Amino acid sequence: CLTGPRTCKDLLDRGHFLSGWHTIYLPDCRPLTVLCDMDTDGGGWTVFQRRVDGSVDFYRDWATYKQGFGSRLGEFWLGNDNIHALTAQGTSELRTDLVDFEDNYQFAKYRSFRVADEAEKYNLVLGAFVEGSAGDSLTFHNNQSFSTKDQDNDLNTGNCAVMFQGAWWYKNCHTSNLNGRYLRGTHGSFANGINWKSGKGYNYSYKVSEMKVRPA
Numbered sequence: 001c002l003t004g005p006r007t008c009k010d011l012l013d014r015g016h017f018l019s020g021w022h023t024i025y026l027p028d029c030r031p032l033t034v035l036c037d038m039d040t041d042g043g044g045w046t047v048f049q050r051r052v053d054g055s056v057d058f059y060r061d062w063a064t065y066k067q068g069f070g071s072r073l074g075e076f077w078l079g080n081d082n083i084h085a086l087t088a089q090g091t092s093e094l095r096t097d098l099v100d101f102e103d104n105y106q107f108a109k110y111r112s113f114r115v116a117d118e119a120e121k122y123n124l125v126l127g128a129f130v131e132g133s134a135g136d137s138l139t140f141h142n143n144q145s146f147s148t149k150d151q152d153n154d155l156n157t158g159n160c161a162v163m164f165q166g167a168w169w170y171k172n173c174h175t176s177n178l179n180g181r182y183l184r185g186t187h188g189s190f191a192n193g194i195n196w197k198s199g200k201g202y203n204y205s206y207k208v209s210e211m212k213v214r215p216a
């Protein structure tokens with residue numbers, strides 16, 4: 001690197017006009033292949049989580065969220081080292097794109113988004129809600145560790161992850177649960193869906209969810 005591309009924004013600027021898997025060089029100069037959203041909100045986004053059809057188990061242990069899981073063809077989670085590697089110098093706006101089972105689109109936009117290395121538990125450190133029709137359902141979670149069903153760092157007696165069946169920056173427990181189960185719309189189970197509270201509440205699992213970052 002030094003010669004190559006360092007962000008999706010960079011690849012947009014080089015005239016990569018369609019979304020897809022391209023290879024950016026991280027700050028450590030290691031190469032990572034990522035999904036570039038070249039479209040939404042003027043494009044240039046590096047997509048780090050994607051749900052879209054129910055095909056992948058997001059109910060995953062710590063190691064599995066450390067490395068990343070899923071498929072390039074479908075849903076995935078880029079992995080918590082990669083995510084940290086991504087947002088750990090400079091600063092990255094965060095966007096969250098949601099789409100329901102009727103194609104009513106919603107988003108939410110934050111001015112900075114960054115996350116701790118494994119040691120500091122991949123602690124979330126989020127800036128300021130900018131806008132978006134889904135409302136703020138991410139600030140609540142600011143300054144929290146990341147947990148999973150086999151690694152509890154939550155401020156609730158029990159296991160937020162085990163009870164709401166996800167992986168997240170879980171306090172007591174959440175307002176957002178984008179890694180929860182794919183429950184395809186209305187659900188009677190309580191909050192263990194792909195949920196964004198201000199978005200569509202604790203009983204409705206979105207059809208698409210995307211979380212992405214561009215350099216501000």
Ligand SMILES: CC(=O)N[C@@H]1[C@@H](O)[C@H](O)[C@@H](CO)O[C@H]1O
Nearest residue numbers: 019036037038039040047097210
């Ligand atoms: C990046 C990609 O291919 N996925 C798209 C993306 O442009 C967008 O985030 C979302 C609505 O914004 O719809 C997704 O399916």
Ligand SMILES: [Ca+2]
Nearest residue numbers: 154156157158
């Ligand atoms: Ca706990």
